[PDB]
Amino acid sequence: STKLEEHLEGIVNIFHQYSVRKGHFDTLSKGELKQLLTKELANTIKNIKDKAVIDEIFQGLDANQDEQVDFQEFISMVAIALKAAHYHTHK
Amino acid sequence: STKLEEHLEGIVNIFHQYSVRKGHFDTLSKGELKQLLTKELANTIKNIKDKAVIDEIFQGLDANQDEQVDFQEFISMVAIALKAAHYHTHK
Numbered sequence A, B: 001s002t003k004l005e006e007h008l009e010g011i012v013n014i015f016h017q018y019s020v021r022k023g024h025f026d027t028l029s030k031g032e033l034k035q036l037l038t039k040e041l042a043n044t045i046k047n048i049k050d051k052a053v054i055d056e057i058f059q060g061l062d063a064n065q066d067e068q069v070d071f072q073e074f075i076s077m078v079a080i081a082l083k084a085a086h087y088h089t090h091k
């Protein structure tokens, strides 16, 4: 595989470690997504200087905590958080 | 960093290796994105059973080949191809 594909493989696997926990095996609730981001992007989130960004994301997840989201929506949200962090994923 | 963060770091770096080549440092043309995907997702693409999916993504990139796309959009496109491959990125 390419480097990109190896990285994606790893992300796919992590997403599914969360999505299999309840209900349909490859979606998770917005409530569950909030937990995932909180733990798995802990350093990225601390690196976001404007705290309204995750405030807003999490407020949206809270507003529809039982709505299901797929990999594509997960990675979209991750990309938002990444950009807000200036792409800083390190402690 | 978490394992998710390490993987995301890798992906950020690869995107920017492409975006720095021409024009604006953090975007690339849809034509350049087609090259990026063709090379860096080569195995994933071969893994897509429905060839109308990548033909269609590529149609859009050819149609609007001079439009600039950012990291968020790159991620979105990668997610579409990945889904179509049932998340298989290995040869």
Ligand code: NA
Pocket: A018, A019, A020, A021, A022, A023, A024, A025, A026, A027, A028, A029
């Ligand atoms: Na689930």
Ligand code: NA
Pocket: B018, B019, B020, B021, B022, B023, B024, B025, B026, B027, B028, B029
């Ligand atoms: Na560029």
